[PDB]
Design an enzyme around this catalytic site. Structure first.
Site, PDB file in Angstrom:
ATOM      1  N   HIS B  41       0.804  -1.227   0.000  1.00  0.00           N
ATOM      2  CA  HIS B  41       0.000   0.000   0.000  1.00  0.00           C
ATOM      3  C   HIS B  41       0.844   1.288   0.000  1.00  0.00           C
ATOM      4  O   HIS B  41       0.266   2.373  -0.009  1.00  0.00           O
ATOM      5  CB  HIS B  41      -1.061   0.023   1.115  1.00  0.00           C
ATOM      6  CG  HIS B  41      -0.538   0.219   2.514  1.00  0.00           C
ATOM      7  ND1 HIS B  41      -0.469  -0.835   3.422  1.00  0.00           N
ATOM      8  CD2 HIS B  41      -0.153   1.355   3.140  1.00  0.00           C
ATOM      9  CE1 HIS B  41      -0.018  -0.311   4.546  1.00  0.00           C
ATOM     10  NE2 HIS B  41       0.181   1.004   4.427  1.00  0.00           N
ATOM     11  N   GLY B 143       1.946   5.798   9.757  1.00  0.00           N
ATOM     12  CA  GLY B 143       3.352   5.712   9.386  1.00  0.00           C
ATOM     13  C   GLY B 143       4.079   4.515   9.974  1.00  0.00           C
ATOM     14  O   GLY B 143       5.242   4.283   9.624  1.00  0.00           O
ATOM     15  N   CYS B 145       3.388   1.388   9.452  1.00  0.00           N
ATOM     16  CA  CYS B 145       3.364   0.294   8.485  1.00  0.00           C
ATOM     17  C   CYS B 145       4.741  -0.085   8.028  1.00  0.00           C
ATOM     18  O   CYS B 145       5.591   0.777   7.887  1.00  0.00           O
ATOM     19  CB  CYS B 145       2.435   0.624   7.322  1.00  0.00           C
ATOM     20  SG  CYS B 145       0.861   1.340   7.841  1.00  0.00           S
TER      21      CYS B 145
HETATM   22  C1  LIG Z   1      -7.099   3.728   5.684  1.00  0.00           C
HETATM   23  N1  LIG Z   1      -5.726   3.318   5.970  1.00  0.00           N
HETATM   24  C2  LIG Z   1      -4.919   4.313   6.672  1.00  0.00           C
HETATM   25  C3  LIG Z   1      -3.432   4.123   6.382  1.00  0.00           C
HETATM   26  C4  LIG Z   1      -3.011   2.650   6.580  1.00  0.00           C
HETATM   27  C5  LIG Z   1      -3.115   2.183   8.030  1.00  0.00           C
HETATM   28  O1  LIG Z   1      -4.019   1.442   8.417  1.00  0.00           O
HETATM   29  N2  LIG Z   1      -2.148   2.659   8.840  1.00  0.00           N
HETATM   30  C6  LIG Z   1      -2.075   2.535  10.235  1.00  0.00           C
HETATM   31  C7  LIG Z   1      -1.558   1.419  10.892  1.00  0.00           C
HETATM   32  N3  LIG Z   1      -1.564   1.248  12.217  1.00  0.00           N
HETATM   33  C8  LIG Z   1      -2.096   2.213  12.962  1.00  0.00           C
HETATM   34  C9  LIG Z   1      -2.649   3.408  12.441  1.00  0.00           C
HETATM   35  C10 LIG Z   1      -3.191   4.435  13.254  1.00  0.00           C
HETATM   36  C11 LIG Z   1      -3.690   5.573  12.693  1.00  0.00           C
HETATM   37  C12 LIG Z   1      -3.693   5.740  11.317  1.00  0.00           C
HETATM   38  C13 LIG Z   1      -3.189   4.772  10.497  1.00  0.00           C
HETATM   39  C14 LIG Z   1      -2.642   3.576  11.031  1.00  0.00           C
HETATM   40  C15 LIG Z   1      -3.941   1.711   5.843  1.00  0.00           C
HETATM   41  C16 LIG Z   1      -3.469   0.467   5.437  1.00  0.00           C
HETATM   42  C17 LIG Z   1      -4.321  -0.418   4.820  1.00  0.00           C
HETATM   43 CL1  LIG Z   1      -3.704  -1.965   4.318  1.00  0.00          CL
HETATM   44  C18 LIG Z   1      -5.639  -0.107   4.584  1.00  0.00           C
HETATM   45  C19 LIG Z   1      -6.118   1.139   4.953  1.00  0.00           C
HETATM   46  C20 LIG Z   1      -5.278   2.052   5.588  1.00  0.00           C
END
Ligand SMILES: CN1CC[C@@H](C(=O)Nc2cncc3ccccc23)c2cc(Cl)ccc21
Ligand SMILES: CN1CC[C@@H](C(=O)Nc2cncc3ccccc23)c2cc(Cl)ccc21
Lengths: 304, 304
Positions: B41, B143, B145
């Site tokens: 992603h 961030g 990830c």
């Molecule tokens: C909508 N979105 C946001 C960015 C990224 C995501 O989940 N990032 C994050 C990971 N861990 C905590 C977080 C805490 C606040 C924000 C992001 C966080 C992500 C990734 C996938 Cl595979 C799908 C959707 C998505």
């Protein structure tokens, strides 16, 4: 989201860990520049720990009696001195992996990461706090002595603890990196009981703020209190008194959540008086006190 | 003495963390040999996450669109490929700090350390477990990830997790280092609810054995049970069924304490049915399930 007992990355500290042997005793040392810091009880036998005269026992030791091993290579000891309860072993080679560092003496309630080591090799890293009775609730086994506690601010490692002993109750005692013990403990196998292990109130309030930031809001109530009223209840529950300094320290968390410090105090007061009723806060059934207000901000903002 | 949520020393893994940027997205990468592994992603905008066709979006990206930064120096990307939900970025320089490593896919109930990173820089290390619903209860922010989960056996780092996303409930989802997600999760901003988060029974039994080794014995009772009787009570409390394999895995702890596995099961059954009554076990008011039997042995023996 999520709130974990998070320790600082240990790499910078692993690069400093060495094995120190004196006769039949082997413990860990911290190698910073051309100096290896270790507990002075490395010069003792098990029989000496009963009533050790460290100045007398140290007379019978020379530079060559201290065997410092970094990785699998021997370091040459060219000097030795005792500073309080730590020995400083001057070696001929400066640690090439020496990070930026400070030696700090922390206050009770302050948290730090420990890199538990055995034979100069790291076994684990965990977070803990200096208890208000100056003990630490660590996880240490025989040979763990010389393992250090530290905090990191970007690239500077502030060393605050060096492990020396386990008290008969399973709790731990040790010194700052100048050899001065935390609390009234002494490096002898003698009856040493700890004082009251009170709860670090300002840290519980910080963790209650972490819970609100992470969506656990059931404990938020309709009340407020004053520092004096709150402290009457805090005293009764063996909680540390809360000061205006603590209220100030909690200011940024108060701002982040829009919940006044004294409102959070009233919420904490009701949790103390009513209990959790089988519910949890951040996956815990008890009120956590080993996260300072600075730790909550750091973890919730992503300081690297 | 003392039992802590201990993570593996992170040094070996810090030496692998890099920053990966694709357009406006910046996340973390794991640099092993001449390959940088990161969530796929990284090629998406926030708008793409709604319904991303990763094969189509990846067509519009070339080697030079992926910016890999190790420390403060840029790595030259000479190849890129997608494997399941991870991108592998071939760089022209092999990581000089590459430790001995394996890529393993763990089972639910197994624990691992996470080195949470932001912008290729480590912020903390904590221990967590693969939940039976294939989520992890980590501590991750935007961030994070590309942060990895790992286990260490002496000098070999077994990478088991790479962080991809936070589910709407605050829990976390990610993949093994082959890009295959744990559980039924997909890398899209879509309604994905987790299944039942059951308690890992074999891990609770291991932590009950850790408590007996560390002197917390109040919960030991006069009873025994059978696997079938125990599992009837375990099912009712949303506890994972206990198998003869779990009994076998608990054998060394059973031997260390002289307490038969089924006697410990009966003790656990009474704790489930009676509660803690305001008492604690190893400083916890709830039964801990994120320590495997191997973790208890390792921590109580001092494996480095
Ligand atoms: C909508 N979105 C946001 C960015 C990224 C995501 O989940 N990032 C994050 C990971 N861990 C905590 C977080 C805490 C606040 C924000 C992001 C966080 C992500 C990734 C996938 Cl595979 C799908 C959707 C998505
Ligand atoms: C009697 N004795 C033992 C060796 C050493 C000591 O406390 N070592 C240990 C430290 N942390 C956990 C332990 C767990 C099991 C065994 C030792 C442990 C020590 C040090 C001092 Cl300053 C005084 C006495 C003493």
């Amino acid at each position: 989201s999520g709130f974990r007992k998070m320790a600082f990355p240990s790499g910078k500290v692993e690069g400093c860990m060495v094995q120190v042997t004196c006769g039949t005793t082997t413990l860990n040392g911290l190698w910073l520049d051309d100096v290896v810091y270790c507990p002075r009880h490395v010069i003792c036998t098990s029989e000496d720990m009963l009533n050790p005269n460290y100045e007398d026992l140290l007379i019978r030791k020379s530079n060559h009696n201290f065997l410092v091993q970094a990785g699998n290579v021997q370091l040459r000891v060219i000097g030795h001195s005792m500073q309080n309860c730590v020995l400083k072993l001057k070696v001929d080679t400066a640690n090439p992996k020496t990070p930026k560092y400070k030696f700090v003496r922390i206050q009770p309630g302050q948290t730090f990461s420990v890199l538990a080591c055995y034979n100069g090799s790291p076994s684990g890293v965990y977070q803990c706090a200096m208890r208000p009775n100056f003990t630490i609730k660590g996880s240490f086994l025989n040979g763990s002595c010389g393992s250090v506690g530290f905090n990191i601010d970007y690239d500077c490692v502030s060393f605050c603890y060096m492990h020396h002993m386990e008290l008969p109750t399973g709790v731990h005692a040790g010194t700052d990196l100048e050899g001065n013990f935390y609390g009234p403990f002494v490096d002898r196998q003698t009856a040493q009981a700890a004082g009251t292990d009170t709860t670090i109130t300002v840290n519980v309030l910080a963790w209650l703020y972490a819970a609100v930031i992470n969506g656990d809001r059931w404990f938020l109530n309709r009340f407020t209190t004053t520092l004096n009223d709150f402290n009457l209840v805090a005293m009764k529950y063996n909680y540390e008194p809360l000061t205006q300094d603590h209220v100030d320290i909690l200011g940024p968390l108060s701002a982040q959540t829009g919940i006044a410090v004294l409102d959070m105090c009233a919420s904490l007061k009701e949790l103390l008086q009513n209990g959790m009723n089988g519910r949890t806060i951040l996956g815990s059934a008890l009120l956590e006190d080993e996260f300072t207000p600075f730790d909550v901000v750091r973890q919730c903002s992503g300081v690297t």
